Amino acid sequence: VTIDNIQKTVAEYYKIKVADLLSKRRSRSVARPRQMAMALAKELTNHSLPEIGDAFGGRDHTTVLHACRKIEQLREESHDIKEDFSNLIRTLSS
DNA sequence: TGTTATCCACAGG
DNA sequence: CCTGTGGATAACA
C-alpha cells in the first residue's frame, strides 16, 4: 500500500480533494479525513512517522503520532469512524 | 468560551 | 534515524 494511494482513496471516500489532505486547514471536515489518512499510512505501510509527516504537507512527525492516537480513540467512541476505518482498509488492501 | 491539530525542543533506543 | 514526552499556541467546534 502506498501513501499516495491512501491519500487518493481517503479523499474520494470523504468527497474532498487530495490537496485538502496536504493543506494546513484544520477544519474538522478535512482534518478528520487527514488524520484518518495519516493513521492508515502508519497501520498499512512501513513508513516512519517522519516520512508520513513529510508526505502530508510537510507535517511534523509528532502530528502524525497525534493523528494515530486520536483515530484510535475515535474508533472506540464512534461507530461511524470505526466503520470508515474498516471500509477504507477493505478498499486499500484489495 | 473550551478544545485540539500543529509545531518545537528534547531525548534515549 | 526512530518513536515518544512536555509544552505552546493558533485554529478550531
Swiss-Prot record:
Domain IV, binds dsDNA as annotated region, ranges: 1-94
Induction (record text): Part of the dnaA-dnaN-recF-gyrB operon. Represses its own transcription; has 2 promoters, both of which are autorepressed. DnaA binds within its own promoter.
Subcellular location: Cytoplasm; Cytoplasm, Nucleoid; Cell inner membrane
Effect of residue 44 to P: Decreased DNA-binding; protein does not localize to the nucleoid, forms inclusion bodies at cell pole(s)
Reported impact of residue 26 to A: DARS1 no longer stimulates ADP release from ADP-DnaA, does not bind DNA. ATP-DnaA is no longer hydrolyzed by datA-IHF
PTM (free text): Deacetylated by CobB. Is also acetylated nonenzymatically by acetyl-phosphate. Acetylation levels increase in a growth phase-dependent manner and peak in stationnary phase.
Subunit structure: Oligomerizes as a right-handed, spiral filament on DNA at oriC. About 20 DnaA protein molecules bind to oriC. Forms the RIDA (regulatory inactivation of DnaA) complex with ATP-DnaA, ADP-Hda and the DNA-loaded sliding beta clamp (dnaN). Interacts with DiaA; this stimulates the association of DnaA with the origin of replication.
General remark: At least 4 systems specifically target DnaA to prevent more than 1 round of replication initiation per cell cycle. 1: SeqA binds to and sequesters hemimethylated oriC, preventing DnaA binding. 2: ATP-DnaA binds to the chromosomal datA locus, hydrolyzing ATP-DnaA in the presence of IHF. 3: ATP-DnaA binds to its own promoter, repressing transcription. 4: RIDA (regulatory inactivation of DnaA) via Hda and the DNA-loaded beta clamp (dnaN) hydrolyzes ATP-DnaA to ADP-DnaA.
Family: Belongs to the DnaA family.
Biological function: Plays an essential in the initiation and regulation of chromosomal replication. Binds in an ATP-dependent fashion to the origin of replication (oriC) to initiate formation of the DNA replication initiation complex once per cell cycle. Binds the DnaA box (consensus sequence 5'-TTATC[CA]A[CA]A-3') and separates the double-stranded (ds)DNA. Forms a right-handed helical filament on oriC DNA; dsDNA binds to the exterior of the filament while single-stranded (ss)DNA is stabiized in the filament's interior.
Domain comment as written in the entry: Domain I is involved in oligomerization and binding regulators, domain II is flexibile and of varying length in different bacteria, domain III forms the AAA+ region, while domain IV binds dsDNA. Binds to the inner membrane via domain III (residues 117-378). Binds dsDNA via domain IV. Inserts into acidic phosopholipid-containing membranes via resides 309-399 which plays a role in rejuventation of ATP-DnaA.
Protein name (database record): Chromosomal replication initiator protein DnaA
Full-sequence portion shown in this chain: 374 to 467 of 467
